[model samples]
Target: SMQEEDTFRELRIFLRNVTHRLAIDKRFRVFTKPVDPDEVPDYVTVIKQPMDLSSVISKIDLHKYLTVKDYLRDIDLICSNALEYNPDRDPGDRLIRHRACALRDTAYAIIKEELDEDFEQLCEEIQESR
Candidate 1:
C-alpha cells in the first residue's frame, strides 16, 4: 500500500502546510483549538459537528482522511459552524462570525489552488475510493 501511502503523505503535507500558512493571521487565535464548552455551553448544542484547525492537524497526522475531498469536508465546517452559532447572539467583536467568514474564505482559497498541484497526478484513483 505504499502507493496509497505516498498518496496521503502528499495530502497530509498539503493539509499541514495550509494550517501553517493560516496560522500567521491574528484572527486565527480563537480557532487554533476547540471551543471551550465552559466558555460557550450552547456551542455543543448548536454545532453537532464542531471542528478546529488543531483537530485538523491531528486528523492529518492520523491519516484519517482518505481522500482530498474528505479533508475538505472538515475544512468546510469551521466557518459554517461559526456563522450558525453566532448568527445573532453576541456582537461588537465578541461574536466571531465575521472572523469565521474571513477564515473560511482563506482556508478555501488556500486549499483550492494547492489541491490541484498535490493531487492532480493520480488522484482520480482516490476519487474512486468513495
Candidate 2:
C-alpha cells in the first residue's frame, strides 16, 4: 500500500490553471513582472525576496514546484512582500499596498472557490502519515 503519487497530477493542473488566471488578471500590473530595479531602484531594497507572476509561471512550467503548498507560497510573496514594503498610513508605496490587498483577495478567493478541499486532502495525508 505505497500509493503516494496520486496527488501530483491534479495538483499541478490546479496550479497551472489558477496561476494563469491570476497573472492574466488585469486589475494589477504589479504581479505580472519582476521588479525592475532600474525602474524603481529602491524596489529591490524594499522587497528582499521578490516574487512575481511571470517567474511563478516559469517555475511551474519548469516543474520547480513539487507540492501544492509550494506554489501557493511563492504566489503569496506578492502580498507578503508588498504588505511590509509600504507603510500603512497614506504613504509612498501605499498605492502598491492597496492593490496588493485586492491581489490576495481575488487570488485566494478564486483558489479556494475553484479547489480547496483537494489540497486539504493531501495536506491531511501528509500530517497523518509517519
Candidate 3:
C-alpha cells in the first residue's frame, strides 16, 4: 500500500523538480524559486487545493505551486511534442514556439498573482543568483 504522506511528499518534490527544470530554459524564466505552497492564500487556496486526487489531476485544485506546475508541464509538453515532430525547420514554426512562450508567460502570471508581494523581489533575487 502507498503511504499517503510519503506519496504526497514525493509528489510535491517531483513538482518542485519539474518547476526547477522548466525554469532553467528562458521560456519559463518567470519562476525563480520554489513557491512556498503554504504562502498561497485562502481564497486562492480554495481555488487551488483539491480535496482529492481526481480534482488535482483535472487541475481543479487550489495552490500556486500546483498551478504553476501544471501550466509548465503543459508548456514542456507543447515544446517537446513539436520538437519531436519536425526536428527541423527554418528557425522553426514560430507558432508552436509562441504557444509554449505564451504558456510560460501565463505561468508567470500565476506566480505573480499568488505571490503578489514576493514576486518582484524574487525576480531580483533570481537576477542576483545568476
Candidate 4:
C-alpha cells in the first residue's frame, strides 16, 4: 500500500513538471511562421509554405503535439497496474487519478482556447487570399 502511495505521489510530481514544460515550450504555436530557411533545412519543416491553416490543422494531430493526452495515458497505465496489484481500489488512487485528470483537462482547455483563436484568424487569412 505504501509503495502504491509513493508511486502515485511521484507520478503526480512528474506529471506536474511534464505539463508545465509542455505549456511553456513554444513548439505548439501552430500558427507561428516557420523559422528562416537559412536557420533550418527545408526537410525540418513542421508546416510547409503556401500554408493553409485548416490543412495544417487537418494534417497535425493535436493529441500528438500536446502533452495532455500523453499524461492521461500514463495515468491510465498506472491505474491499470494498481488494479492488477490489488483488485481493491484505494481512495488515494482515485484521488491521484482525479488530480491528474483535472491537470490534463485544464492544460488542454487553455491550449484549445488559444488554438481556436488562431484557427479563426487563419480562416480569415485564407478567405482574404482568394
Candidate 5:
C-alpha cells in the first residue's frame, strides 16, 4: 500500500493547490455564467489521468449527505476533459456541435436528480439578466 501512498499524497497536494488557485483566481466564477461563450478560456481543466477517486470519495461520506460539491467537481472534470480535446474552441460550442444536446441534458438531469433542485435555475437567472 505504500507504493500507492505517494500518488495519494501527490493528489492531495494538487487538490489543495487547485483549491487555492481557484479561490485566488476566481476560476469558479466562470461556472456561474450562463451560456458560456466560445471565447472564454478553460479556467478549470481536468487532468488526463484524473485525481484519485478513492481519496475524493473518502473525504466525503456521499451517502450521508448529498451536496452540490461532488456533482460540481465531476462537471468541472468533464468540462476540463472536453476542453483538452479542443483547447482553441469554446467548450459550450464544442459540446453543442460534437456531443449534441444530450450532454447538457444529462448534466441537468444528474443535478436535478441528485439535488432535487433545478441546477439550471442559476443559468436561467443569468440568462434572464443578460
Candidate 6:
C-alpha cells in the first residue's frame, strides 16, 4: 500500500511539473492568460486532509485537469472540420492547429507520466500481496 505522505509527494510533483510546463510553454498562453505568475505557488495545494488514494485520484478528475483531455478531443474535431471544409487552407490556421497539437501533446505527456508512476506503485502492491 502506498503511504499517505508518498501519495501527497507524488501529487505535488505532478502538479509542479504540469504547472511549470503550462507556465513556460507559449502554446499554452491562452490557458495561462489569466493566471498570475506572482500569485502562483511552486506546487498546487490541496485543502482537504486525509490524502488517501481515493482523494488523490479524485483530485485530477476535476474539470480543471480533465479539460486538457477535453481540449485535445475538441482540437481533433476542429482539425477534422477544417480539413473537410478546405483541403488547402491558409498557413495561419495551420500554425494555430500545430500550436493546439503541441499543447495537447504536452498535457497528455505530463498526465501519462504521473499515471504511469501510480500504475507502477499499484503493480508493486499487487505483487507484494501475491
Assess each prediction's global lDDT (C-alpha) against the native. Answer: 0.77, 0.75, 0.42, 0.40, 0.40, 0.45
Query: Which structure is stronger by lDDT: 4 or 6?
Result: 6
Could you give candidate 1's per-residue lDDT for residues 2-95 as a string of tens digits?
7777877887787788877776688877878999989889888979999998998898898787666677678678877877777675574445
What TM-score does each of the candidates earn? 0.83, 0.76, 0.30, 0.28, 0.29, 0.39
| True lDDT of residue 119, candidate 1 | 68
Q: How do the residues 56-75 of candidate 6 rate in per-residue lDDT, one tens digit apiece? A: 23444442222234333443
Superior candidate under lDDT, 1 versus 3? 1
For lDDT, the strongest prediction is 1
Question: Candidate 6: lDDT of 118?
Answer: 53
Cα lDDT for residue 54, model 6?
A: 27
Note the residue pairs that clash in candidate 1.
Answer: none
Q: How many clashes would you count in candidate 2? A: 0
Pitting candidate 3 against candidate 6, the one with the higher TM-score is 6
Tens-digit lDDT string for candidate 4 (84-119): 333435885565445434444555565465434444
Q: What value of lDDT does candidate 2 attain over all alpha carbons?
A: 0.75
Candidate 6 lDDT (Cα, 0 to 1): 0.45
| Candidate 3 segments exceeding 4 Å error | 1-67, 90-92, 116-130
Report clashes for each candidate as comma-separated counts.
Answer: 0, 0, 5, 0, 0, 0
Over all chains combined, what TM-score does candidate 1 have? 0.83
lDDT tens per residue, model 5, 14-123 = 33433333323332333323323365334233334342223334443333113344435654554554455445576655643344223334445544554323433433
